[PDB]
């Protein structure tokens, strides 16, 4: 099993200087192919995390040019030079080469003190020791049928973690391997819509749901969420 291993775990950089953060794996990600699949992803705090690279260091469309990062093999570095107020945020590298598909631990990029597409998510949701929950993803702005569908399981306590994906055409889930298949992704391509359910449901099982979406990065579909997500809540 793969490990991915995020340095360092907080970051002070002050305007303008220079930003370095290193992804280390287990072992070697680069896909039996000849493609590196890996991602540098940017949550900014009460909003959707969003793509900044795809692709070892391919940057993905809308992004400015200062956020540039490369590598190989177990090393990645992502650099971000001339650090503005809208590139603060916490970071996460992110392997999608072997599945399961992994994150890292985060890095939150702070300060040194001194001197339309879109897809629809269903409500928050309240509930019990065991009781279920399935949880709604409407698709708005694209062609549904093209992307896969990741989910991704959110806590502050236990970070991000890959909850599975799936094909819209032939219903093509994935499971990780740590949810057993517990959890099941259902498509119906009627109305454009991805859901989640999920059983067995623990203090540690509490956390926010988003439902994993964009692309090109090529040859593969579907990476970036890019979307609302879905408090769910289980309370004793």
């Known amino acids: 099993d793969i490990v991915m291993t995020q340095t360092p775990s907080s970051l002070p950089v002050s305007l303008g200087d220079q930003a370095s953060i290193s992804c280390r794996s287990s072992?070697?990600?680069?896909?039996?192919?000849?493609?590196?699949?890996l991602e540098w992803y940017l949550q900014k705090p009460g909003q959707s995390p969003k793509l900044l690279i795809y692709?070892?260091?391919n940057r993905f469309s809308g992004v400015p040019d200062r956020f540039s990062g490369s590598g190989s093999g177990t090393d990645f570095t992502l650099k971000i030079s001339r650090v503005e107020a809208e590139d603060l945020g916490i970071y996460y590298c992110?392997?999608?080469?072997?599945?399961?598909?992994?994150f890292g631990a985060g890095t939150k990029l702070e300060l040194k003190r001194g001197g339309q597409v879109q897809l629809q998510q269903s409500g928050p949701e309240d509930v019990k020791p065991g009781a279920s929950v399935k949880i709604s993803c409407k698709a708005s702005?694209?062609?549904?049928?093209?992307?896969?569908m990741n989910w991704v399981k959110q806590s502050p306590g236990k970070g991000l973690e890959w909850i599975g994906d799936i094909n819209p055409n032939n219903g093509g889930t994935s499971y990780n391997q740590k949810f057993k298949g517990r959890a099941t992704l259902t498509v119906d391509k009627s109305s454009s819509t991805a859901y989640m359910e999920l059983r067995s449901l623990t203090s540690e099982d509490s956390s926010v749901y988003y439902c994993?979406?964009?692309?090109?990065?090529?040859?593969?579909?579907?990476?970036?969420?890019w979307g609302q997500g879905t408090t769910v809540t289980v309370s004793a």
């Open positions: 072992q070697s990600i680069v896909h039996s192919n000849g493609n590196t699949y």
């Open positions: 702005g694209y062609t549904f049928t093209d992307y896969y």
């Open positions: 992110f392997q999608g080469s072997l599945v399961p598909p992994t």
């Open positions: 692709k070892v260091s």
């Open positions: 994993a979406a964009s692309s090109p990065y090529s040859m593969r579909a579907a990476m970036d969420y």
